[PDB]
Scaffold this active site. Structure first.
Site, PDB file in Angstrom:
ATOM      1  N   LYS A  17      73.646  33.521 -46.198  1.00  0.00           N
ATOM      2  CA  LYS A  17      74.364  34.765 -45.906  1.00  0.00           C
ATOM      3  C   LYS A  17      74.724  34.849 -44.420  1.00  0.00           C
ATOM      4  O   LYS A  17      75.773  35.391 -44.095  1.00  0.00           O
ATOM      5  CB  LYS A  17      73.524  35.997 -46.332  1.00  0.00           C
ATOM      6  CG  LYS A  17      72.892  35.894 -47.723  1.00  0.00           C
ATOM      7  CD  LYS A  17      73.919  35.829 -48.862  1.00  0.00           C
ATOM      8  CE  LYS A  17      73.359  35.132 -50.085  1.00  0.00           C
ATOM      9  NZ  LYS A  17      74.000  35.617 -51.340  1.00  0.00           N
ATOM     10  N   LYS A  36      66.622  26.434 -41.529  1.00  0.00           N
ATOM     11  CA  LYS A  36      67.503  27.560 -41.839  1.00  0.00           C
ATOM     12  C   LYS A  36      68.153  28.080 -40.525  1.00  0.00           C
ATOM     13  O   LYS A  36      67.467  28.581 -39.634  1.00  0.00           O
ATOM     14  CB  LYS A  36      66.775  28.641 -42.649  1.00  0.00           C
ATOM     15  CG  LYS A  36      67.601  29.884 -42.936  1.00  0.00           C
ATOM     16  CD  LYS A  36      66.815  30.745 -43.916  1.00  0.00           C
ATOM     17  CE  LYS A  36      67.657  31.878 -44.451  1.00  0.00           C
ATOM     18  NZ  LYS A  36      66.837  32.784 -45.335  1.00  0.00           N
ATOM     19  N   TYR A  86      60.502  21.664 -46.990  1.00  0.00           N
ATOM     20  CA  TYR A  86      61.630  21.159 -47.778  1.00  0.00           C
ATOM     21  C   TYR A  86      61.180  21.076 -49.236  1.00  0.00           C
ATOM     22  O   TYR A  86      60.106  20.554 -49.527  1.00  0.00           O
ATOM     23  CB  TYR A  86      62.040  19.784 -47.248  1.00  0.00           C
ATOM     24  CG  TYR A  86      62.869  18.904 -48.161  1.00  0.00           C
ATOM     25  CD1 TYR A  86      64.105  19.329 -48.642  1.00  0.00           C
ATOM     26  CD2 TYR A  86      62.462  17.604 -48.464  1.00  0.00           C
ATOM     27  CE1 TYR A  86      64.885  18.505 -49.453  1.00  0.00           C
ATOM     28  CE2 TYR A  86      63.258  16.754 -49.228  1.00  0.00           C
ATOM     29  CZ  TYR A  86      64.472  17.202 -49.704  1.00  0.00           C
ATOM     30  OH  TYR A  86      65.203  16.343 -50.465  1.00  0.00           O
ATOM     31  N   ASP A 130      63.622  40.119 -53.306  1.00  0.00           N
ATOM     32  CA  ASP A 130      64.822  39.289 -53.518  1.00  0.00           C
ATOM     33  C   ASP A 130      64.531  38.070 -54.412  1.00  0.00           C
ATOM     34  O   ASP A 130      65.036  36.979 -54.181  1.00  0.00           O
ATOM     35  CB  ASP A 130      65.506  38.891 -52.177  1.00  0.00           C
ATOM     36  CG  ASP A 130      66.987  38.552 -52.321  1.00  0.00           C
ATOM     37  OD1 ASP A 130      67.616  39.014 -53.301  1.00  0.00           O
ATOM     38  OD2 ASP A 130      67.506  37.788 -51.490  1.00  0.00           O
ATOM     39  N   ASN A 135      66.643  31.668 -55.037  1.00  0.00           N
ATOM     40  CA  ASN A 135      65.534  31.789 -54.063  1.00  0.00           C
ATOM     41  C   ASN A 135      64.225  31.230 -54.569  1.00  0.00           C
ATOM     42  O   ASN A 135      63.200  31.381 -53.905  1.00  0.00           O
ATOM     43  CB  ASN A 135      65.364  33.239 -53.572  1.00  0.00           C
ATOM     44  CG  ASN A 135      66.530  33.781 -52.786  1.00  0.00           C
ATOM     45  OD1 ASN A 135      66.796  34.996 -52.733  1.00  0.00           O
ATOM     46  ND2 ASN A 135      67.231  32.919 -52.117  1.00  0.00           N
ATOM     47  N   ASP A 148      62.956  32.422 -49.407  1.00  0.00           N
ATOM     48  CA  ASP A 148      63.848  33.430 -48.875  1.00  0.00           C
ATOM     49  C   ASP A 148      63.213  34.802 -48.812  1.00  0.00           C
ATOM     50  O   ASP A 148      63.491  35.699 -49.615  1.00  0.00           O
ATOM     51  CB  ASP A 148      65.193  33.443 -49.617  1.00  0.00           C
ATOM     52  CG  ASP A 148      66.228  34.333 -48.985  1.00  0.00           C
ATOM     53  OD1 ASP A 148      65.929  34.945 -47.896  1.00  0.00           O
ATOM     54  OD2 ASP A 148      67.316  34.476 -49.579  1.00  0.00           O
TER      55      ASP A 148
HETATM   56  N1  LIG Z   1      63.387  24.678 -48.003  1.00  0.00           N
HETATM   57  C1  LIG Z   1      64.498  24.430 -48.709  1.00  0.00           C
HETATM   58  N2  LIG Z   1      64.598  23.254 -49.371  1.00  0.00           N
HETATM   59  C2  LIG Z   1      65.697  23.009 -50.098  1.00  0.00           C
HETATM   60  N3  LIG Z   1      66.778  23.776 -50.268  1.00  0.00           N
HETATM   61  C3  LIG Z   1      66.662  24.933 -49.583  1.00  0.00           C
HETATM   62  C4  LIG Z   1      65.575  25.328 -48.815  1.00  0.00           C
HETATM   63  N4  LIG Z   1      65.770  26.601 -48.304  1.00  0.00           N
HETATM   64  C5  LIG Z   1      66.968  26.926 -48.743  1.00  0.00           C
HETATM   65  N5  LIG Z   1      67.559  25.968 -49.514  1.00  0.00           N
HETATM   66  C6  LIG Z   1      68.888  26.054 -50.118  1.00  0.00           C
HETATM   67  O1  LIG Z   1      69.716  26.837 -49.259  1.00  0.00           O
HETATM   68  C7  LIG Z   1      70.038  28.097 -49.895  1.00  0.00           C
HETATM   69  C8  LIG Z   1      70.025  29.217 -48.878  1.00  0.00           C
HETATM   70  O2  LIG Z   1      68.671  29.448 -48.394  1.00  0.00           O
HETATM   71  P1  LIG Z   1      68.058  30.905 -48.193  1.00  0.00           P
HETATM   72  O3  LIG Z   1      66.740  30.859 -47.498  1.00  0.00           O
HETATM   73  O4  LIG Z   1      67.875  31.519 -49.576  1.00  0.00           O
HETATM   74  O5  LIG Z   1      69.150  31.738 -47.380  1.00  0.00           O
HETATM   75  P2  LIG Z   1      69.768  33.209 -47.542  1.00  0.00           P
HETATM   76  O6  LIG Z   1      68.768  34.203 -47.087  1.00  0.00           O
HETATM   77  O7  LIG Z   1      71.046  33.205 -46.777  1.00  0.00           O
HETATM   78  O8  LIG Z   1      70.153  33.432 -49.009  1.00  0.00           O
HETATM   79  C9  LIG Z   1      69.038  28.219 -51.041  1.00  0.00           C
HETATM   80  O9  LIG Z   1      69.475  29.094 -52.079  1.00  0.00           O
HETATM   81  C10 LIG Z   1      68.893  26.757 -51.482  1.00  0.00           C
HETATM   82  O10 LIG Z   1      70.024  26.314 -52.240  1.00  0.00           O
HETATM   83  O1  LIG Z   2      67.409  35.138 -43.288  1.00  0.00           O
HETATM   84  C1  LIG Z   2      68.463  35.730 -43.436  1.00  0.00           C
HETATM   85  O2  LIG Z   2      69.584  35.131 -43.687  1.00  0.00           O
HETATM   86  C2  LIG Z   2      68.645  37.227 -43.291  1.00  0.00           C
HETATM   87  C3  LIG Z   2      67.827  37.824 -42.134  1.00  0.00           C
HETATM   88  C4  LIG Z   2      68.077  39.329 -41.964  1.00  0.00           C
HETATM   89  C5  LIG Z   2      67.909  40.110 -43.275  1.00  0.00           C
HETATM   90  C6  LIG Z   2      68.707  39.488 -44.421  1.00  0.00           C
HETATM   91  C7  LIG Z   2      68.344  38.009 -44.587  1.00  0.00           C
HETATM   92  C8  LIG Z   2      68.911  37.373 -45.830  1.00  0.00           C
HETATM   93  O3  LIG Z   2      70.065  37.457 -46.202  1.00  0.00           O
HETATM   94  O4  LIG Z   2      67.995  36.741 -46.459  1.00  0.00           O
HETATM   95 MG   LIG Z   3      67.790  35.732 -48.074  1.00  0.00          MG
HETATM   96 MG   LIG Z   4      68.583  33.063 -50.526  1.00  0.00          MG
END
Ligand SMILES: Nc1ncnc2c1ncn2[C@@H]1O[C@H](COP(=O)(O)OP(=O)(O)O)[C@@H](O)[C@H]1O
Ligand SMILES: O=C(O)[C@@H]1CCCC[C@H]1C(=O)O
Ligand SMILES: [Mg+2]
Ligand SMILES: [Mg+2]
Ligand SMILES: Cc1c(C(=O)NS(=O)(=O)N(C)C)cc(-c2ccc(Cl)cc2)c2cc[nH]c12
Length: 258
Positions: A17, A36, A86, A130, A135, A148
């Site tokens: 996001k 991330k 990971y 969430d 996630n 997440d």
């Molecule tokens: N530790 C991880 N290992 C593998 N894939 C990951 C990992 N963390 C995130 N991802 C991938 O990246 C995407 C975005 O990560 P995420 O932490 O959920 O971000 P956001 O808060 O923006 O949704 C996940 O839905 C998954 O597809």
């Molecule tokens: O880690 C993030 O991308 C963001 C941090 C701030 C709150 C919202 C959160 C998210 O979309 O999961």
């Molecule tokens: Mg998130």
């Molecule tokens: Mg996510």
């Protein structure tokens, strides 16, 4: 402590996001991890800079085999970098997309893994808020890992993608607690068995009404035991939803897990 120069960056693991998640390797140790990456300008524009501190503080203090580890963070002039464990087998989201539906054994094993991770969380008054397939990550042995913690908070809270997994109390903007994750668990159980979430719709508007009314139906292939567990988790009233101990001792769970 850490800086970008300490890691070799690989392919992106997924779109976020507020940035992207990348495969990365720590240069000295050869530790493979997920990085991330979040843009400061975007976090500031949305006013979520303190909630990002919350994701970090909450996730960094959780130690459980079904919860993704957050090792640390660092930041530069334009970005914040979260150092994550990971998850080599990816998302439950992608497994569901390729398999269409999960059998009762796979579903109930995932529900048990989720209930155990959630029990741990709630024991510290941590609400994830969430819980959704994108996630839910998979470890090397295919074990589920809650990830997440972006919207995570301590309970009770009244603090402000699709609404598919959110309970009526959060959708309305009301006070909420650990019971929000019990509703989400119900939405997940249905989705695993059916292939789509119970309130799925074309619009955010139509989905809002469905959650508010608790308007959902089961396809005929859903078993009596599965309907029982789901129907119990999907109560408009948070007080009426069961404890996680009750989910874990449900006959359908015990007969099909793990
Ligand atoms: N530790 C991880 N290992 C593998 N894939 C990951 C990992 N963390 C995130 N991802 C991938 O990246 C995407 C975005 O990560 P995420 O932490 O959920 O971000 P956001 O808060 O923006 O949704 C996940 O839905 C998954 O597809
Ligand atoms: O880690 C993030 O991308 C963001 C941090 C701030 C709150 C919202 C959160 C998210 O979309 O999961
Ligand atoms: Mg998130
Ligand atoms: Mg996510
Ligand atoms: C500008 C800024 C800082 C910050 O203090 N930066 S700095 O003045 O040290 N400078 C190098 C620009 C720090 C953060 C931040 C937020 C959350 C975490 Cl976990 C870590 C860092 C954010 C998020 C959006 N803008 C930010």
């Amino acid at each position: 402590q850490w800086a970008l120069e300490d890691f070799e960056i690989g392919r992106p693991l997924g779109k976020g996001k507020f940035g992207n998640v990348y495969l990365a390797r720590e240069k000295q140790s050869k530790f493979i991890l997920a990085l991330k990456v979040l843009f400061k300008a975007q976090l500031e524009k949305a006013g979520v800079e303190h909630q990002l501190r919350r994701e970090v503080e909450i996730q960094s203090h959780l130690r459980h085999p079904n919860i993704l580890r957050l090792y640390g963070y660092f930041h530069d002039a334009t970005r914040v970098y979260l150092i994550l464990e990971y998850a080599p087998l990816g998302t439950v989201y992608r497994e569901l997309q390729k398999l269409s539906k999960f059998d009762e054994q796979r579903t109930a094993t995932y529900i048990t893994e989720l209930a155990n991770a959630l029990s741990y969380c709630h024991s510290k008054r941590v609400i994830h808020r969430d819980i959704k397939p994108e996630n839910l990550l998979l470890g090397s042995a295919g074990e589920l890992k809650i990830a997440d913690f972006g919207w995570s908070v301590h309970a009770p809270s009244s603090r402000r993608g699709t609404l598919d997994y959110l309970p009526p109390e959060m959708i309305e903007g009301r006070m909420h607690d650990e019971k929000v994750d019990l509703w989400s668990l119900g939405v997940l159980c249905y989705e695993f068995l059916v292939g789509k979430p119970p309130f799925e719709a074309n619009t955010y508007q139509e989905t809002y009404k469905r959650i508010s009314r608790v308007e959902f139906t089961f396809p005929d292939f859903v078993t009596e035991g599965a309907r029982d567990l789901i129907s119990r988790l999907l109560k408009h009233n948070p007080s009426q939803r069961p404890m996680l101990r009750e989910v874990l001792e449900h006959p359908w769970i015990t007969a099909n897990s793990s």
